[PDB]
């Protein structure tokens, strides 16, 4: 530990979304969507500042939960609250 709380120190082994949920055995059901659902590339929380809309099919490489947050922030009142978006997704997964 340099400065890390107890939960992250416990789950220092590999990379887990919101420091609780695994990526190890996540089976996808359709061979059609195994190319376009990105769960090979792990992430810690969905808020990743990327330019995933420069050309075609870069949303085919941004992760799936980032897409879930970025589609949750879709109305005329929650257009910028991405921290609200990731809080909502964390709550829903719990």
């Amino acid at each position: 530990y340099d400065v890390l709380p107890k939960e992250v120190l416990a789950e220092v082994g590999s990379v887990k979304l919101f420091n609780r949920w695994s990526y190890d055995d996540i089976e996808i059901r359709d061979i059609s969507l195994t190319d376009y659902i990105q769960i090979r590339a792990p992430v810690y929380i969905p808020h990743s500042a990327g330019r995933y809309a420069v050309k075609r099919f870069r949303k085919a490489n941004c992760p799936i939960i980032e897409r879930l947050t970025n589609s949750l922030m879709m109305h005329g009142r929650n257009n910028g609250k991405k921290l609200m978006a990731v809080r909502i997704v964390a709550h829903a997964f719990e």
């Binding site: 340099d2 890390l4 992250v8 220092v12 990379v15 919101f18 420091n19 810690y44 929380i45 808020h47 921290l83 990731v86 809080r87 964390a90």
Partner: peptide, 13 residues
């Protein structure tokens, strides 16, 4: 803020 601490711990982790 209490939700970006994981983005802080990403390089150490």
């Amino acid at each position: 803020p209490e939700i970006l601490r994981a983005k802080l711990y990403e390089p150490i982790l």
